[PDB]
Each structure stands twice: as structure tokens, then as C-alpha cells.
Amino acid sequence: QTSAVQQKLAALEKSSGGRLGVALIDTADNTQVLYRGDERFPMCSTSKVMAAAAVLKQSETQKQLLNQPVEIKPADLVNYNPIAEKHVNGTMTLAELSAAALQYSDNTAMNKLIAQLGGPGGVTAFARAIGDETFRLDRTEPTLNTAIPGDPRDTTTPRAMAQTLRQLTLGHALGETQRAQLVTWLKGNTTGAASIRAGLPTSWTAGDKTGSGDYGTTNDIAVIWPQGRAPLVLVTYFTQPQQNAESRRDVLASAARIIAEGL
């Protein structure tokens, strides 16, 4: 069946020229709304959530892990490191690296999270441990954002990512303290106001993690507290046919608006 919401998302996609993937979970009733929900998309920096969460999981058995220093060397800087570059020749703690990766989308910080987990496969292994059979991280920053059509590396599906984000932020994939820390980090994101958030009523609150890459890939994943009802989890992924395509955060906002209007 095709619902009214799915028809509207198809019309938005058609006018955009790209490929749109949406997954909503409404925790009011656990119902899902899916558009291309089982197709693969490049995650880009939305993968930073999984990496930070995996470090939070490690911290459950090491009370001091988040305070552990990690050396930042000049050679560690990559292409977008607004926080890490301040600390080159010094150190940042794993908490600081998590906050920088999540709230500022710092790619050096993400690489330190990946290294703490033993490489990209350590992030995948954590995904599997929390019941996500779909997620895969294959590369570090910056190359995980190449976003080539048909490339399975560094991809997931909207359905899998929405389920994972629910388990991490609202469910019990993490300890209570760690879940609360992840939610605090997501709610303090600096990069999200033009993406899913832009499509929601202003009275609502949310936390989110954006991503973008080549092929005009423009992504956002959010946990949302609407006025007067239970939380939502929403994933919006978007990718385009040309390598040099522009970002389209407005398409993510439009998708979010259609979802909000369909509740």
C-alpha cells in the first residue's frame, strides 16, 4: 500500500531530482512510516552517533574512560576540525571528542572515536551488539563521505537507523547515565536548524545529528519531543545523481514537515 504521506514524500522526491529515504517511529503507538525505508544510503556524519554511543557503552565498565586523554597531533587534522585544531600538540578527553564529533561535526574527533573502538569495524561490531544488522562503517574520515551511488561502504537503511536511534536515545541499548549523556549531546547540536528541525512546529524540541558528503548527500537523524505527545524518531537521508551536487537541507525540512502533518 501507498499512504497519503508516502505519496507526498514521492512528490517531494520527484521535484528534488534526487533519492529520498525516510523512517519515522512514533513512540505514541510504535508505528512506523517508511519511504525507501529498506534502501541503502551513505550515512556520512550521521555515523558519528554510532561511534559516540559505542564509546559510551565502553564507559559503562570504565568510570574514567570519558576523562581519558587522547593526543591530537598535527598529522591527525583532516578536512573539518573546528574543535580539534585548537588542541593540536595537546590532548582532548574522550568526552570532549564525543561532544566535538556530535555537536560540531568535527572529523578529527570522529577519527579518535573510531580509533578508540579499534577501527571502523569496531563501530559496526557495536551496531551488531545492539541489534542493528544493517549499519556498516568501513572507512575513517574524510573518505567515509564519498557517497558514491551503489557503493555499500559506510551505509545503512532509514529503517535500521531509526530503530537504532530509538534504542540508543529512548530505549535501553545504553545504561541510563549514558543514554542521558547522548541525549544531552544531541540536544546541544549546533548544525541542525536548517534540516529536520526546520520542518517541525517551533514549539517542539529535538536533538539531531546531520551529515553531508559528495553526490549532494544531505542527511539528518533526530529524536523529537512534540508538544503534547510521546517522542518520535525520524531519519531523513537524501542523495543526488551528480558528484558535485549542492546540499539540499530544505528537502529534509520538507520531508519532516510532511511527516509532522501526517501524525
Ligand SMILES: O=C(Nc1cccc(-c2nnn[nH]2)c1)c1ccc2n[nH]cc2c1
Ligand atoms: O568530510 C566531508 N564532509 C563533512 C565534513 C564535516 C562535517 C560534515 C557535515 N556534518 N553535518 N553535515 N555535514 C561533512 C567530506 C565531503 C565530501 C567528500 N568527498 N570525499 C571525501 C569527502 C569528505
